[PDB]
Amino acid sequence: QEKMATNTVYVFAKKDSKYAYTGECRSCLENSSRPTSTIWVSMLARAIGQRIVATLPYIKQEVPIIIVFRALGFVSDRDILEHIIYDFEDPEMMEMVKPSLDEAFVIQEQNVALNFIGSRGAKPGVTKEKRIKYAKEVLQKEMLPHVGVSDFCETKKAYFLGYMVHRLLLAALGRRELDDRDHYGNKRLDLAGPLLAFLFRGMFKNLLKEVRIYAQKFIDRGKDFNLELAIKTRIIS
Amino acid sequence: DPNLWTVKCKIGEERATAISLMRKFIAYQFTDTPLQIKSVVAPEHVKGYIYVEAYKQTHVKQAIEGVGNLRLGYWNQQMVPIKEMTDVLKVVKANLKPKSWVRLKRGIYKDDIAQVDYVEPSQNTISLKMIPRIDYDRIKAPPQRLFDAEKIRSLGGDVASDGDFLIFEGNRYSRKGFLFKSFAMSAVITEGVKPREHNFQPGDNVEVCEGELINLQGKILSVDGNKITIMPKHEDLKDMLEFPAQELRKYFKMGDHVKVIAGRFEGDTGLIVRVEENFVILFSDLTMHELKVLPRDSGVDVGGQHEWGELVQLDPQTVGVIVRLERETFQVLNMYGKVVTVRHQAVTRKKDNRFAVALDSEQNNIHVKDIVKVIDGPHSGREGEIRHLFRSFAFLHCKKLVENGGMFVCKTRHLVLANELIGQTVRISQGPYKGYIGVVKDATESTARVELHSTCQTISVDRQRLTTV
Amino acid sequence: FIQMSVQRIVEDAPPIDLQAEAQHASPPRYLLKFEQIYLSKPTHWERDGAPSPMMPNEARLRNLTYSAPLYVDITKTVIKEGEEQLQTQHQKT
Amino acid sequence: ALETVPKDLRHLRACLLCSLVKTIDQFEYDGCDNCDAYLQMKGNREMVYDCTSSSFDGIIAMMSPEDSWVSKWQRVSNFKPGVYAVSVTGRLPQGIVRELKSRGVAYKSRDTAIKT
Amino acid sequence: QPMIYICGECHTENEIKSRDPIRCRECGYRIMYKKRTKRLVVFDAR
Numbered sequence: 001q002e003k004m005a006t007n008t009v010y011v012f013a014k015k016d017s018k019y020a021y022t023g024e025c026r027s028c029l030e031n032s033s034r035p036t037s038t039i040w041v042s043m044l045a046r047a048i049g050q051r052i053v054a055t056l057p058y059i060k061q062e063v064p065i066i067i068v069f070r071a072l073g074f075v076s077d078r079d080i081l082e083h084i085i086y087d088f089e090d091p092e093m094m095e096m097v098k099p100s101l102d103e104a105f106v107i108q109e110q111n112v113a114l115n116f117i118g119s120r121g122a123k124p125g126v127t128k129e130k131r132i133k134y135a136k137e138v139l140q141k142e143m144l145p146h147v148g149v150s151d152f153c154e155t156k157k158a159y160f161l162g163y164m165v166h167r168l169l170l171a172a173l174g175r176r177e178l179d180d181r182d183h184y185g186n187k188r189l190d191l192a193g194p195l196l197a198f199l200f201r202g203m204f205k206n207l208l209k210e211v212r213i214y215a216q217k218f219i220d221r222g223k224d225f226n227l228e229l230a231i232k233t234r235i236i237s
Numbered sequence: 238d239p240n241l242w243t244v245k246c247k248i249g250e251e252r253a254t255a256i257s258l259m260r261k262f263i264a265y266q267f268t269d270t271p272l273q274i275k276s277v278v279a280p281e282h283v284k285g286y287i288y289v290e291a292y293k294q295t296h297v298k299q300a301i302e303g304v305g306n307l308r309l310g311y312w313n314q315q316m317v318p319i320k321e322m323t324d325v326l327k328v329v330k331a332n333l334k335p336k337s338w339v340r341l342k343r344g345i346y347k348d349d350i351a352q353v354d355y356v357e358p359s360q361n362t363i364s365l366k367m368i369p370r371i372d373y374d375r376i377k378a379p380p381q382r383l384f385d386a387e388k389i390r391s392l393g394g395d396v397a398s399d400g401d402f403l404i405f406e407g408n409r410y411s412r413k414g415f416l417f418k419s420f421a422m423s424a425v426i427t428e429g430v431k432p433r434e435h436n437f438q439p440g441d442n443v444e445v446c447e448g449e450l451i452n453l454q455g456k457i458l459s460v461d462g463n464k465i466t467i468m469p470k471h472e473d474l475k476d477m478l479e480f481p482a483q484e485l486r487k488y489f490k491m492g493d494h495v496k497v498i499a500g501r502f503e504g505d506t507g508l509i510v511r512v513e514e515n516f517v518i519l520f521s522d523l524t525m526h527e528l529k530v531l532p533r534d535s536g537v538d539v540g541g542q543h544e545w546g547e548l549v550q551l552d553p554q555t556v557g558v559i560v561r562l563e564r565e566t567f568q569v570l571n572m573y574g575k576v577v578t579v580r581h582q583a584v585t586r587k588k589d590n591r592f593a594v595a596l597d598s599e600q601n602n603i604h605v606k607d608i609v610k611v612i613d614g615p616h617s618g619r620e621g622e623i624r625h626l627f628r629s630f631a632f633l634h635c636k637k638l639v640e641n642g643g644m645f646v647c648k649t650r651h652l653v654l655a656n657e658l659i660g661q662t663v664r665i666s667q668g669p670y671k672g673y674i675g676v677v678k679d680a681t682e683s684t685a686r687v688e689l690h691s692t693c694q695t696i697s698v699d700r701q702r703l704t705t706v
Numbered sequence: 707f708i709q710m711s712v713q714r715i716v717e718d719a720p721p722i723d724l725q726a727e728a729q730h731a732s733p734p735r736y737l738l739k740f741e742q743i744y745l746s747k748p749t750h751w752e753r754d755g756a757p758s759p760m761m762p763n764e765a766r767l768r769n770l771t772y773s774a775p776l777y778v779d780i781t782k783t784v785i786k787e788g789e790e791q792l793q794t795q796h797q798k799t
Numbered sequence: 800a801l802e803t804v805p806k807d808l809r810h811l812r813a814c815l816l817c818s819l820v821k822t823i824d825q826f827e828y829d830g831c832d833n834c835d836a837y838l839q840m841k842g843n844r845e846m847v848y849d850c851t852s853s854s855f856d857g858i859i860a861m862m863s864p865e866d867s868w869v870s871k872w873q874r875v876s877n878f879k880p881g882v883y884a885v886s887v888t889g890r891l892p893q894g895i896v897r898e899l900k901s902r903g904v905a906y907k908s909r910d911t912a913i914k915t
Numbered sequence: 916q917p918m919i920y921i922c923g924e925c926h927t928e929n930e931i932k933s934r935d936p937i938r939c940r941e942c943g944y945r946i947m948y949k950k951r952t953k954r955l956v957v958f959d960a961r
């Protein structure tokens with residue numbers, strides 16, 4: 001079974017949409033239980049014009065990228081621009097990056113950006129400190145799993161996301177060209193190995209979530225339990 | 238005041254949920270994690286979910302944490318509305334006579350007509366007078382028949398005689414050939430047996446029996462179960478009124494067609510000639526034999542010994558069925574198909590064998606109550622219900638037959654309940670296909686089709702050309 | 707797949723720790739962690755004879771499933787009270 | 800306390816006076832947890848069979864009757880927390896009711912059912 | 916009546932009656948082939 005390659009940045013340009021260019025990188029850890037968490041970094045198609053948004057998994061609305069960086073932990077602006085435009089002597093990049101910068105000059109610290117993301121989340125927290133934790137969890141695990149999920153991977157995620165934005169800007173300026181969807185370099189083949197892995201992982205999780213139920217049903221009364229009876233050998237086979 | 242919140246629970250385990258929440262409340266009532274809820278309700282008849290009394294939904298969620306039985310109500314809670322909270326704790330909680338007749342709902346005695354020998358004052362059961370359907374523990378490692386106490390004493394088993402009274406086979410009580418055993422009132426059918434209620438249908442003419450509206454007659458527009466709110470359109474009245482069922486009766490001027498809805502006669506039709514106080518008399522369409530029935534809807538001769546449709550012995554050899562009642566005589570349809578007139582005392586009442594079995598024209602077993610078609614003899618083409626069987630004779634009833642009150646008699650054998658070469662390895666010994674081995678599929682007087690073993694083809698040859706193996 | 711991916715899938719699953727219904731009167735748990743998957747060659751017979759390897763042609767003829775049983779060894783470690791830890795390991799589960 | 804709470808589902812009986820639902824073991828061993836001083840069914844099984852009910856509808860785990868509208872509708876706010884019955888079928892004999900009224904306790908029925 | 920069968924493994928003609936488990940009296944092998952029939956077969960050489 002063919003599929004689009006994972007952990008790679010693709011800059012596309014769909015014809016009829018509110019935004020002209022869009023950069024996606026569907027991401028997967030080394031065969032983790034989480035599915036392909038696809039993140040799009042997009043640019044609007046025309047005031048000021050050409051703002052850059054990044055629709056995020058488990059987020060209902062698009063979020064401007066600078067707010068994403070401030071939520072990720074970069075208070076300043078020079079530091080954020082150091083992760084997107086790698087050479088400051090190129091003013092053409094700045095002229096297109098400032099329309100997105102001036103969109104978000106009302107967020108200046110990490111927590112307000114976390115609140116902004118949490119308000120747009122699928123599960124909006126009722127208090128501020130709940131949205132903070134929800135958006136922090138989303139940034140920690142949902143966004144860009146392949147670059148790392150650990151205590152401190154903010155710098156690496158910021159570097160990769162700034163690279164994604166830089167890739168989008170390169171396609172917008174025409175310095176590079178749009179990636180081809182039918183290019184079988186961008187495709188991957190799911191053979192017996194990967195397919196059986198994907199399906200066995202789900203069935204194994206289902207087996208565990210019934211061993212757990214049997215264990216609960218015996219430990220609520222607290223007498224004892226038997227793992228031999230707990231294991232349901234039928235499900236996997 | 239706090240409010241009630243629905244929490245979904247495990248089915249059949251709602252009382253135990255309230256007990257576990259009360260133990261959890263008392264176990265943590267002095268600790269730093271208190272249950273801030275006020276009460277827990279698990280009703281007697283509400284199955285599937287319980288109620289939590291609290292000022293907040295968050296108090297309910299933090300109180301039901303750790304309870305697995307409520308885990309399908311853990312994420313979201315639904316509040317019982319304010320006007321409906323008293324509906325939570327709100328609790329809610331003729332037709333049968335002595336010597337009347339009912340039908341038992343279960344058993345081998347299911348659907349059998351049974352007389353109510355005794356009504357128990359505690360209203361739990363009724364003693365029922367039946368005729369047993371037993372093999373006397375001989376066949377067991379059936380039609381109704383009179384209880385032979387000598388036979389059950391001969392066969393033995395669970396038997397205890399006390400004169401005519403006898404206890405047998407699971408405390409089955411019998412006396413003088415009949416059964417007298419208590420069965421539950423919930424286990425019997427009390428109405429419609431005919432060995433309160435209301436039945437009104439749009440289109441019927443009804444009369445008002447009482448009220449200032451008395452003696453209005455009109456036709457039914459609509460119907461409800463009790464207060465019918467029968468909406469009659471009365472003669473000369475364009476308005477619709479409302480009447481409860483109890484205020485109405487089914488009226489009918491003489492000359493209209495009527496149907497008998499329930500009774501001994503039910504299914505029969507006729508024109509009502511005369512209407513009496515509550516009495517209504519009519520002539521059937523099948524036969525002109527008279528009928529007298531109640532307005533909502535006897536059958537026994539003067540003297541009470543006999544009744545229409547009963548089997549009688551005319552002389553030592555001849556049986557018949559009574560088909561007309563006269564003041565001194567009966568008209569009896571004899572087993573030969575002739576109708577004779579006899580004085581009431583000149584015939585004897587014959588014990589009917591409700592469990593009789595016979596063979597029809599196709600050797601099917603036929604029984605009383607069976608529907609049969611007549612395929613030979615005088616009544617060929619008719620259809621009827623078997624009412625009685627005797628030797629080679631069957632007395633049948635068909636309501637469409639007006640003659641003899643629907644009764645007629647047929648012989649049981651006039652009733653019905655409503656090659657060699659094939660597969661033989663042959664060898665064509667003559668002709669163009671000579672020497673081929675095949676199997677005969679079809680065969681006639683003249684030719685035969687042969688499935689050839691060699692080719693993919695079945696061909697037909699003469700039988701004079703074939704030679705078997 | 708059957709060499710390393712099944713191993714990594716069976717090992718990266720988090721252990722499950724499970725408590726009672728938060729109290730009994732006015733609750734300890736266990737871990738039950740398992741690893742080191744084992745896989746054997748296809749076998750065929752059940753309670754009628756000593757189990758024997760499945761020929762693929764026999765599977766085709768008898769409409770069997772030419773499958774192989776996989777085994778794990780589990781280590782359930784349980785703490786209740788008094789700070790005494792006992793772990794029981796069940797091989798070839 | 801936990802002594803009021805029934806131990807199992809078998810032979811649950813509601814009181815005739817305050818609709819307290821306990822098992823027959825707890826009525827035999829503890830009496831009534833609210834008004835045994837007015838009834839004295841502890842130390843007597845026949846007093847329990849005369850003063851408790853075999854037919855009840857609905858249970859209420861009354862945890863805080865001081866702030867419960869259900870305790871206002873069921874008139875059990877001045878009592879102790881415990882397991883209560885909504886509808887109780889049964890009645891005390893006239894000797895017990897007259898003896899309670901001589902001690903100033905008029906017997907209000909807990910049969911709050913809508914009988915047809 | 917006899918309905919002699921053939922073991923798939925050891926090729927042993929072994930008697931089996933109706934309504935018996937498919938078993939070979941040696942080698943425990945559980946796949947049986949029936950026999951060649953006795954009735955006449957006539958094949959054209961075409």
Ligand SMILES: [Zn+2]
Pocket residue numbers: 814815816817818819831832833834
């Ligand atoms: Zn009491």
